[PDB]
Write the structure tokens for this entry.
Amino acid sequence: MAASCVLLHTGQKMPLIGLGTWKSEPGQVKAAIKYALTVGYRHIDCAAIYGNELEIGEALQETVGPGKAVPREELFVTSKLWNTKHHPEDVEPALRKTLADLQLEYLDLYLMHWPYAFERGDNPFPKNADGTIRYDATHYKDTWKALEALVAKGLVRALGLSNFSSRQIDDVLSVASVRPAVLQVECHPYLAQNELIAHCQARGLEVTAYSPLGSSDRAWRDPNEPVLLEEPVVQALAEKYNRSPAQILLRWQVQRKVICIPKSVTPSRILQNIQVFDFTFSPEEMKQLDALNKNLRFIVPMLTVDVPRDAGHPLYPFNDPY
Ligand SMILES: NC(=O)c1ccc[n+]([C@@H]2O[C@H](COP(=O)([O-])OP(=O)(O)OC[C@H]3O[C@@H](n4cnc5c(N)ncnc54)[C@H](OP(=O)(O)O)[C@@H]3O)[C@@H](O)[C@H]2O)c1
Ligand SMILES: O=C(O)c1cc(Cl)cc(Cl)c1O
């Protein structure tokens, strides 16, 4: 309880800062979880596809539960269902594998990672022939019903959506017996998602900003695109407040009640990342940061440098205006 929370429609308190775990590798992730929990983190964001749940599970078993440093009821754990696991028959075995890897009895939030499905099987990136992705045409509404059955089994407290557009979200609500509780999408001053955030508050979904720091060490990247953390306005607010640029980026979000999940393995950065509730931007400063909006998306799935992997798919979420 270093961080403040938001109330989900379920009644669960969701901390406004969580630890991101994308690219924290086995061999380092265990130390990150442990450091983050011990300095006050009560919110971990995970996914099967990140390939580190087995070692995250090792750290959680040591530190969380009856007899341990952290009670289980005070930890918010999120995971996500991968694209190969959209068929109703596969949703439950996928989740139980994640539960086993994590050594958990339940998840607090389970998200649908993408609205489109991949070919069923044990290959996370199944391919053709030409090396393009092999797709499966399971509709996200069918996946959603199968996810609801997990809530009934006590395996998950809340459900939600990742990389869904406003129309996909409303499509899900038209059939939802258990309403999604959270949308997780890319958000920061260059891609402010003001429209989609307003749409979510209308519908009772809370919003989690992924890549809240511009994800500065993503695996390829254009030479010529700006770096969010180097942004002049951000660097000058940093100096004004005696804070780091990352703290500026995160304060902007929690100030509008957007949940953030910054990833770090650096103990000093982990510490500072959750220390965003002791200062406040003036309306005019907020405005400066609201002026940076440029529709710059950093996280787009790519493959085979011999391209944008899914951009051409009919269910690709990023083609609508929001
Ligand atoms: N739903 C989805 O499809 C999806 C997609 C993308 C991301 N996510 C989630 O959101 C999380 C966060 O996003 P992200 O990992 O893409 O990137 P991010 O959190 O925006 O950026 C992390 C990068 O910034 C560095 N960093 C951390 N704190 C810093 C600080 N205080 N000052 C300067 N640099 C700092 C990290 O380095 P060090 O670690 O070395 O310290 C790392 O290179 C992910 O880990 C994942 O859990 C989900
Ligand atoms: O969105 C992600 O975090 C992500 C992570 C990994 Cl490791 C692979 C793909 Cl396609 C992703 O989309």
Notes: Residues 20-22, 45, 113, 162-163, 184, 210-217, 229, 244, 246, 261-266, 269, 272-273, 299 surround NAP (ligand 1) (CB under 6 Å). Residues 106 and 155 are 5 Å apart (CA to CA). The radius of gyration is 19 Å. The chain has one domain: 1-322.
